[PDB]
Amino acid sequence: KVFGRCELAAAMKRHGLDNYRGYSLGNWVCAAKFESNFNTQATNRNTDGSTDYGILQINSRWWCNDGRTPGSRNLCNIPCSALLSSDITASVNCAKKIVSDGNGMNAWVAWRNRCKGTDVQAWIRGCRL
Numbered sequence: 001k002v003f004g005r006c007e008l009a010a011a012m013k014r015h016g017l018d019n020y021r022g023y024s025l026g027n028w029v030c031a032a033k034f035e036s037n038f039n040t041q042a043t044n045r046n047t048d049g050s051t052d053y054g055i056l057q058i059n060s061r062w063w064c065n066d067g068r069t070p071g072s073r074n075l076c077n078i079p080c081s082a083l084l085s086s087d088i089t090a091s092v093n094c095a096k097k098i099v100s101d102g103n104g105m106n107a108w109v110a111w112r113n114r115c116k117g118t119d120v121q122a123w124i125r126g127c128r129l
């Protein structure tokens with residue numbers, strides 16, 4: 001599923017991501033924009049052999065199981081395929097664990113490089129929330 005911008009903002013808020021660990025909703029929408037362009041079915045293969053899955057490009061090295069990432073963990077206790085669903089529940093619940101891991105949203109390199117420090121409220125501007 002490819003979400004609309006305000007559609008995704010609303011779904012993220014529904015699932016309690018707004019201001020989770022102090023990160024406003026626009027931070028999350030911005031991260032999703034640059035990770036997946038709001039496409040739940042996005043996948044990308046990393047140089048180390050792990051794969052990133054879903055709207056927030058959650059990585060199989062630590063967070064989900066895909067059966068093809070040697071030495072990895074599955075700390076969200078989910079198949080990586082669950083992160084590709086039109087229902088964002090699994091991605092949101094896993095993102096909550098990731099952002100709580102110590103480095104906040106810097107866990108998402110694209111957030112650090114493209115969202116951090118910017119006017120992230122622009123990503124939810126105009127949205128009925």
Ligand SMILES: [Cl-]
Pocket residue numbers: 001002
């Ligand atoms: Cl689609």
Ligand SMILES: [Cl-]
Pocket residue numbers: 005033
């Ligand atoms: Cl957009």
Ligand SMILES: [Cl-]
Pocket residue numbers: 024025026027120121122124
């Ligand atoms: Cl915001």
Ligand SMILES: [Cl-]
Pocket residue numbers: 065066067068069070071072
């Ligand atoms: Cl594996």
Ligand SMILES: [Cl-]
Pocket residue numbers: 072073074075
């Ligand atoms: Cl594990």
Ligand SMILES: [Cl-]
Pocket residue numbers: 011086087088089
């Ligand atoms: Cl949803």
Ligand SMILES: [Cl-]
Pocket residue numbers: 021022103104105
């Ligand atoms: Cl933080």
